């Protein structure tokens, strides 16, 4: 890897078929700047603060996405039609701040080694699902050309409850729940 | 079957602007095949897939790409990163705990950037033994965190200190425990 | 006159059709 004070990741584009699944992001020092909601065609920032002052124009990347739909078709053929190799994801659950009972916290679920970039991360408390408080970052890039996502979940520290982070992929024959509890 | 194509435009800045390097990788599936390297100065195939491609891109696109370094890297840094990302400074959440020879887990959470220093003290004396630590934890919400243990046995009356140094703090943080 | 953000372009390779 190249050593340096800072690293920009402008232009990071990614396209796949079938399904017309594409993505465009910008990173700085490995922290996602924003992505671009292709359907609404809007520059969706990661953090509010940033996209107030200076701005990014959604078309800059709605175009990249178009070039990558084209480039794909070229290589797909030029490589005798070589499909991608599914790799298995590695989950790592953990609290965002010092866990104290009955104090609003956040439960991060970091998933790594993804490819194809198509993942179904879902949270689960006490063997029954959860849907409230769950944010989820776009696919951030790796140096090895795979990806890592994170699924956040706010909660209240209880030793009664058991959290699992359910991860579903094609490179998995069946889902992978990484268990977590304040008990241990 | 599933097929993928990526593209990464990386801009490396060292000593601020005084040294910039620009890589650019066109990647089928997981296999990088073409690549612009500002150091090299031109496009270079990297697998047999983008063998005749380098000729093309060099033919068609080489000129503009070479300036993308000063027109996209240089610019973004000076004009959009300097006043936003580099400006961001977060103060940490120092909080000493106690294991489940006991252990003084001293958490330090939610900060930015990643530059920091987390020393331990025993009655005003620095300790390097027993003291474990973790690898800088990237939260993703533009904040960090790290847990700095300290295996010890506690005599009544003894004072401890988690000493944290960060750019967001003029005066180093200290947290004590009896 | 608020400066904005640029974003490295990715180019098409020869196709024919």
């Amino acid at each position, epitope marked *: 890897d190249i050593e340096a004070d800072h690293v920009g990741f402008y232009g990071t584009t990614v396209y796949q078929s079938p399904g017309d699944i594409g993505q465009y992001t910008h990173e700085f020092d490995g922290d996602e700047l924003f992505y671009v909601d292709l359907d609404k065609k809007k520059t969706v920032w990661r953090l509010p603060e940033f996209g107030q002052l200076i701005l990014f124009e959604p078309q800059g990347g709605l175009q990249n996405i178009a070039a990558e739909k084209h480039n794909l078709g070229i290589l797909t053929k030029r490589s005798n039609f070589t499909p991608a190799t599914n790799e298995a994801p590695q989950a790592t659950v953990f609290p965002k701040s010092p866990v104290l009972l009955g104090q609003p916290n956040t439960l991060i679920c970091f998933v790594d080694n993804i490819f194809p970039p198509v993942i179904n991360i879902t949270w689960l408390r006490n063997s029954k699902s959860v849907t409230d408080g769950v944010y989820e970052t776009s696919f951030l890039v790796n140096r090895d050309h795979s990806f890592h996502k994170l699924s956040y979940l706010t909660f209240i520290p209880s030793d009664d409850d058991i959290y699992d982070c359910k991860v579903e992929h094609w490179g998995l024959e069946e889902p992978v729940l990484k268990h977590w509890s304040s008990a241990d | 079957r599933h097929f993928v194509h990526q593209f990464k435009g990386e801009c490396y800045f060292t000593n601020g602007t005084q040294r910039i390097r620009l890589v650019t990788r066109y990647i089928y599936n997981r296999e990088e095949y073409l690549r612009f390297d500002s150091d090299v100065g031109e496009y270079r195939a990297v697998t047999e897939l983008g063998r005749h491609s380098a000729e093309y891109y060099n033919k068609q696109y080489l000129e*503009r790409t070479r300036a993308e370094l000063d027109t996209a890297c240089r610019h973004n840094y000076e004009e959009t990163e300097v006043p936003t990302s580099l400006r961001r400074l977060e103060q940490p959440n120092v909080a000493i705990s106690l294991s489940r020879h006991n252990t003084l887990v001293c958490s330090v959470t939610d900060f930015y950037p990643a530059k920091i220093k987390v020393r331990w003290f025993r009655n005003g004396q620095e300790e390097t033994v027993g003291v474990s630590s973790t690898q800088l934890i990237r939260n993703g919400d533009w904040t960090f965190q790290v847990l700095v243990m300290l295996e010890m046995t506690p005599h009544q009356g003894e004072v401890y200190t988690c000493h944290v140094e960060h750019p967001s703090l003029k005066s180093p943080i200290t947290v004590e425990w009896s | 006159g608020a400066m904005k953000r640029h974003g490295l372009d990715n180019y098409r390779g020869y196709s024919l059709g």
Partner: T-cell receptor
Amino acid sequence: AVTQSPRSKVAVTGGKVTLSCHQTNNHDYMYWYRQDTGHGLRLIHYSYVADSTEKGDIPDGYKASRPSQENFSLILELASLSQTAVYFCASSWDRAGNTLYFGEGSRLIVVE
Amino acid sequence: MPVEQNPPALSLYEGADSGLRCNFSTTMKSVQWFQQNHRGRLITLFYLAQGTKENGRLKSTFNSKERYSTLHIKDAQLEDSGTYFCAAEDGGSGNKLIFGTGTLLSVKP
């Protein structure tokens, strides 16, 4: 290569003028500009994927349309007086320039 | 004002030289110099990404960082009349082409 038509047109105020364009360069981008009283050409619509039009700087009162890859039509539904100008069609691939190639102008004139 | 063409129009005689300034507001990816003849047709003279180029009696330069681009014509001829345009690429707001306000060149005999 890029060829427009009509190469010139005269229209009543309140009529539908429909400028067509057609290129044989297999270029993905196409543009429609307009040239007013010697002060430059100004983008109105572009398009970089069949059946996708994208607004330009002064897209007010025009409707573009990219049916196939070779064709890109500009449409005024209610010809105005202020829409008298010369409309240039240019194309390209990939991102301009060095491979953008312009049309030949289309003098439009609108009378009451 | 994104692009700025100067002068707005100029006079000249045979053989004599002159230059044309083009100052921008932000950093533009590539510039492109044109010239609209008497017919009304746009003819590309230069496409620059950086530095300078030269073509016979013509020569141009481009500096993204210092936000400007010049066009120096040496040994003016008659055929050299007609207006002149520099377009610049945006990259920031889409990558539009932003043309200047033309510069009517008149080459006296």
